[PDB]
Amino acid sequence: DSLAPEDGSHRPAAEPTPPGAQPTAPGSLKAPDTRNEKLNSLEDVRKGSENYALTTNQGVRIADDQNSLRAGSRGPTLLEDFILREKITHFDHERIPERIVAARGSAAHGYFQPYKSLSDITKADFLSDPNKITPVFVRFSTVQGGAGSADTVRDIRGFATKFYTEEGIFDLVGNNTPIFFIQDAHKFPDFVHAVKPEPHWAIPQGQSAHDTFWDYVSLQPETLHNVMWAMSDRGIPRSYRTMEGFGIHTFRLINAEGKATFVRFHWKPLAGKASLVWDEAQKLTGRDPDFHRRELWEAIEAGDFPEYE
Amino acid sequence: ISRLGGPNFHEIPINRPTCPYHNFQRDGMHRMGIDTNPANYEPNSINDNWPRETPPGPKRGGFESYQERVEGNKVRERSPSFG
Amino acid sequence: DSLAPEDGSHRPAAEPTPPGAQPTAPGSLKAPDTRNEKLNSLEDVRKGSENYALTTNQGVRIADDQNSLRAGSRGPTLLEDFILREKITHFDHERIPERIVAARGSAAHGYFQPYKSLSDITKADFLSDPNKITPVFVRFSTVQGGAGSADTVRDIRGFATKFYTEEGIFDLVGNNTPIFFIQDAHKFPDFVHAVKPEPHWAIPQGQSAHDTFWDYVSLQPETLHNVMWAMSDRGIPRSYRTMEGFGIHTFRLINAEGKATFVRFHWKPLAGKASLVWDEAQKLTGRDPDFHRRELWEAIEAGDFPEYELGFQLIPEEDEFKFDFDLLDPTKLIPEELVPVQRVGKMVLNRNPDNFFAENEQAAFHPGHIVPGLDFTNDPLLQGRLFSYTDTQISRLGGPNFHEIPINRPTCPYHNFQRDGMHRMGIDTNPANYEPNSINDNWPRETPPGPKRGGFESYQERVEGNKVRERSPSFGEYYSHPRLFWLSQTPFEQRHIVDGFSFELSKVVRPYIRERVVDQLAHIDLTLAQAVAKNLGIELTDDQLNITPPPDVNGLKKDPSLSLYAIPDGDVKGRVVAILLNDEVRSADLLAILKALKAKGVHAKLLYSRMGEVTADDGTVLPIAATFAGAPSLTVDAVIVPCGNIADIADNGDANYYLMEAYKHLKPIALAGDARKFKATIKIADQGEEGIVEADSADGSFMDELLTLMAAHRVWSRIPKIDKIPA
Amino acid sequence: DSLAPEDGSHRPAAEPTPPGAQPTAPGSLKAPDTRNEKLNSLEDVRKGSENYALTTNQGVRIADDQNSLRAGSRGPTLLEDFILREKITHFDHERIPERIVAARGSAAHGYFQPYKSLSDITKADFLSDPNKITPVFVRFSTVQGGAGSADTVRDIRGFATKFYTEEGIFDLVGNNTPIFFIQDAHKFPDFVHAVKPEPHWAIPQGQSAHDTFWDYVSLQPETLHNVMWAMSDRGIPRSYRTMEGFGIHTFRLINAEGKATFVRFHWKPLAGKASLVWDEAQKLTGRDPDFHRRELWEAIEAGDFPEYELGFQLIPEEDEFKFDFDLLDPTKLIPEELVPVQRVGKMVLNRNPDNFFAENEQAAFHPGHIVPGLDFTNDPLLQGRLFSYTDTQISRLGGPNFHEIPINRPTCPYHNFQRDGMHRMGIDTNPANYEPNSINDNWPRETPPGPKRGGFESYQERVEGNKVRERSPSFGEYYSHPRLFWLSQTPFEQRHIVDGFSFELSKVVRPYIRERVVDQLAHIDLTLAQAVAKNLGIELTDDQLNITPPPDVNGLKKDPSLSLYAIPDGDVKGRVVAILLNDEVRSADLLAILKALKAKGVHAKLLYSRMGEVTADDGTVLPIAATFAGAPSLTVDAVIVPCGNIADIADNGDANYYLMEAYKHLKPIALAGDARKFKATIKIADQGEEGIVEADSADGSFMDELLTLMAAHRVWSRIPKIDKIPA
Ligand code: HEM
Ligand code: HEM
């Protein structure tokens, strides 16, 4: 009303600013001129708010959003207060189940472009032309902790990329280490239950440092290779910008002549490889549990775009 | 909420209002609307309090219940006039 | 097979053991003879495992649980592998929506018993006899963070108690502070959206230290009272065992006459009140984000049962309007100096759950779950709460039969005409599903209200007024309770409050918000306002310096029951001491140390710079619980360094840091013999300092001094000295 | 209140009673002594009602269940009415998604027993010993219609049996026809979308008589075999008790030695095969849409337990390629003339559920639910099914713990490391939730396959070929089975098939679809095609008239097991006779009539122009079951009209129409003494005609003759006489 400050210092500059210079903001307000085909296609569901009246979800303007309807100002709330029930009902149903694994993750929009046409080895449309730009949506994540867990834990990191190609969506769902812990998918629940919080007390969060994990590892030597990677500084990346990414599995590339080539997918961080040291990582889960999320958001706001080859 | 899977049933095409609708409600299963408002609460200063409440009035005013006088004890009782 | 060690060291002993002595275990395996009616009636759903074959959920025995079915050993997985798909499917669908608020919580089973019959003031069956034992299920929680967030955040704590009475479930759903942030339930989504992670980027987790929180607060002065409690050390409890519990709202007790008495509910920690200090709390969110969940679990496994005394603040109906605040206003507390708490009974938490998810995650508590003998009031916050828990549970727990989830089932009879719904467990045999009916002779039937075993009838409160969306004028006073709270704190508690505000507002990016918040503080107390203003580099104006303080609350200028520490109440039983070992420890010191701690129920954790063992000066082999870095001082209440070969650890950076961190955090430190060489890292005078125990050896006098310091919890006189300690 | 009638007539006797004699009731109240292991295992969730207080779900007794809590008796309802809100909330959430197909179904509990050990061909524990009783839960169903659609529609029927064995649940999910419409599961949605109500307007319900179905059929000739079955009288069974059941797919039996035998599963109705005629069936969907559900339930309450004989078509692994059709093609049947059905066991359905929703609606069957001793085959329709049921059940039944819904639970042990999920009932105490583990000594553990009680291991079938999306060329033959079916039917069955096709094609609005179906029929048989073309005013072209018929099936030009009626198998027990009363019934006829029916377990319903009683000629008071319009001839198998004051009903339109309708639907009619006046109603010659029982009284051979007619079900010779007749 007169709630915003008269000097306009409540609104962040809609331009690239370094970390801590302005309050962060929704991407389309912070950077309205950045676009791609996927961001333009989301325009039909985007909702503004400046200059609009406050309403129910049925479009009824609300007069008093400070109070419930009661019989007397000190009286009982009435069942006929449908404005209050819609508001509390929506509020009551806000949560959805978090992801079974990779619940903790940070994402951002971007784009991909191949350096040259790869039609000699694959007929994939998004790799068929250097001028063909594919919008992407990438989510970086940890594995074990819940959506409310800390970022700089010692854990494997997920690196998922959604490619909005002209011949369909291609998701490249990888990790920051080149192998997995286990060989057959049948043992996935076994391995994930062993790493996750123990079932009696649901401890510990975002840590493989407990009995069941090491029990499993000791009895399943196949896990040692990824364990080595986890115990190294690969388990505590400086940021999502300074970690490698791998599809891990051997997939196949299929060209127009029908020839198959085995392929393993890689993401190279153009900012280079860099990790924290354990002590720093662990203290940081306490001082700023949102440090990787924040780091990623702020780099993009600053114009320091995460780049991967 | 269970028949239509959540609190966003007003976003199912047939149910959408054709007039404007803006508020601070967020999330829920199958959220379609992507809110850009910096604020998800009011009163707020960060979005200058928008969207804002609207006083009741003759046209285009906010909803205000008719102020019926309520007088009685808290009872689980059928009115004798309904008998 | 046989993967377990032949020595049987994989299975914890089914007897009470101290923290860290054994691997923790499911409650029914750790304490099989700890029983209560609720715990025994859960036996029908308890599932064992030893000596059973591994099967599908359909009962089919599995031969190979290591591999998928494939065409050839290097071939493609086949769609007919129904064994893999049931296993992956169940795993794929394990998660359920966390609680909208209070997602993060830790729970345990216990029992409650009254001290005397309360039938003069209430017909509630569970309060009717001192010999009536009510099973309880209690969930302690934070508010803001998700299920995976840390425990020792600065935040309000929830204290929910499910009473399984013989006349129904009664849930007392309270918090650890006596008031709430807002007045009307209509603003709950606004307040919660403000405190929760901001919507663009979902930061920050488990913290109110961000712009939207303080933005809402600056614009809604009714929030200040609860904000003062959150900014005090009340917001960073040492443990769920050492914090108060409150229902917040004024409820009603109804007796068999039908007379109504206004009541506010209290939980008094019989272990007393104790909180961390901010740096310790925040660093503990990183070193052990499961600290309170673990402490609760391990206190119960050790037989250090969390015990609380239920207390009632009772106000006669005719006294409704005798205070200078509205009784129905949830942002207003009833000073204990005005209305004393009457000790009503005691609750003991003596058993952990078997399966966190099944019992803790799925537990459903509701403030509206009341029983004949209790009734609501018009408190506008409580009024809206009555609607909400019912509503959220339908999606959180997938349908309307959440009361059939084992942990939520009443222990008493339940019969009605409600039918179906997702996952219906009950198979009703009633020929009728409606009333009135003649085909089942109208059963189950209504029951008139009465003195005992009667149907529920609301107290007939007179209601007069127009249908209005209006805040009661009586609720429009926002600074006197915050002032009464502030003035009732000790000087160091005040300083921790100032520091809490200063820290939080430092992280608010928009400077105008900090300014608006400092302006609110100026209407509470000038000194408070000035100290926060000075830490923010803000100058109060002329006008802000002259804001007349709010009036006292009914003549009170302070109430010591609002302080954590003003009136001594600490208990050392269940506390923990870190003992910094060396490679030739003076065995006589250890013996004396361990004996004195055991006599007070104080646990010890033996630390060294590597795992394994060390040998004392007489060949006594001492097993090491953790390293210095592995179990930081943050996790203990005091630190003892016995004599021996001090040169072994005297250059250990970690050993020295242990002492400086403990020192910074006001913890009692005891140094024996050449362990006194460690005085130089924490810069203690030759003549000593109160809070540091030191002597030629660790005899009985040394332990008495140490144990006395621990009973006083922290060394508050050390505050001014920690400034010049780089830690 | 105490609303039951003093007299106790609100409650049905807990003893077998004929249909209509008592009010029907929950199975456990109606037949408390009928037990089995599964019925006894459900006792833990059964809930009574008599003599209990009416409460909320939390156990709080309710005083007033007639009113909401309001401010003043004419005031507004208050949000604090938690009793109202829980009651309405449960009500609001009663429904769950109906089954994607087979939403309309009727179920019952029973038991199974093998005639002899089948140990030589299968190690399946439930077939290993004739004294080993296996509890079953069976659901019969239509396919297309919703849960609220009618029973006697023209459609395929589902016949699903849940076997609660000692080594796991085994579900046999079959149909009442031995083949399915399509070959590969990938086209299931296409086929189901086609038969289901059209997407713009959701019409028609419970019917394949619409354009999209016939469009699909005309473009996919593989569907023709099952279309023939559906168009025949097979698609409108008289009752679930009188239809055959089939697994359709070829599965494998695996013995202890590891030998695999191919098997197709069969269910033989011990009450024989019997169907309605289309006009009766369609009309019965209006007069009583619950006719099959009702008949099943009343058969069981009467003690006429539906009994079926399990049968196996067995084929050695060396004979896989010995037939003209692929054994893995589900659109092909295995002629019983080539591979006889060997009798395996008997299934008796002897108790109704207590609660339809809890037991019937939430029951989840799955053809992938097999046990050691059974295995799958590469049938591409079966292969896709294995995926579908698991998936659908996770939303229909709200999560991955649907095996914990009482009806679905195994009666044998089930232990694994699967955890959580919505609605988790089992509280696991296992310290481990993964394997291999040392902390619980690896329990529960895997079990190697063996002759008895061993782990499941798939039969090691050789797999060879490229990863292709391809239909086996051996499946590409579509007309010979349809032709074999056609030729095996009686002449009157063939006319009914012609009539079913004609009727259905008449509802296809786009004439070219009709023509295309006619063209497909002309590839099956010229007589069939021409008769259907003629009914649709279509002329076959000369090319159509010369399409060469498909080859015989392995030398067979007919197989009488494919007919409902070619080989008598009539059983009159549980059938019902309508008795048209007058106001002075000759009591001697009535005694004769009722005793003769009773002797054969044939029920009766005494009908009149009004309810109440009539007094026979000797003062005997006759209670009226229903009016002529109230329980129409569609619901009975035969009609008897006893002597008396016939002039009482001679000019009653309903009484006359009663006989015209029964006469039209080929039902036996018996007229005693002056009831022969009704002969002119149905145009019977003085001489009499086969199918009409007539005599001066109901004495001597009157009832034996009537009962011989009932044993042959319908009077097929009357068909040409019904052509005319305005009814
Ligand atoms: C090569 C090994 C694997 C890698 C690199 C990997 C990677 C990932 C990543 C990065 C995510 C998070 C995606 C997001 O940001 O939303 C994820 C989620 C998930 N993963 Fe995988 N994963 C692997 C193995 C598996 C296996 C073997 C299974 C089960 C058989 C599995 C099941 C899941 C599930 C159920 C989710 C959650 C998806 C959702 O809720 O949308 N993962 N995985
Ligand atoms: C005096 C003020 C309040 C107190 C003391 C309080 C206390 C609590 C506690 C302790 C819990 C967690 C219970 C558990 O451990 O599961 C909780 C959860 C919850 N609160 Fe309240 N709360 C208050 C205000 C409100 C209001 C005003 C609303 C909405 C109108 C609300 C809605 C909820 C909901 C929806 C949950 C989650 C319940 C579930 O998912 O089972 N709370 N609250």
Ligand code: HEM
């Ligand atoms: C031989 C062919 C088939 C037969 C004999 C058959 C039989 C049945 C029966 C009897 C039922 C209902 C069981 C009950 O009463 O609950 C059913 C349901 C169902 N059918 Fe099959 N069906 C066949 C083909 C298929 C195929 C090819 C699919 C998909 C690939 C499929 C998917 C389903 C589904 C999803 C259900 C619903 C089950 C539930 O919600 O529990 N059916 N079918």
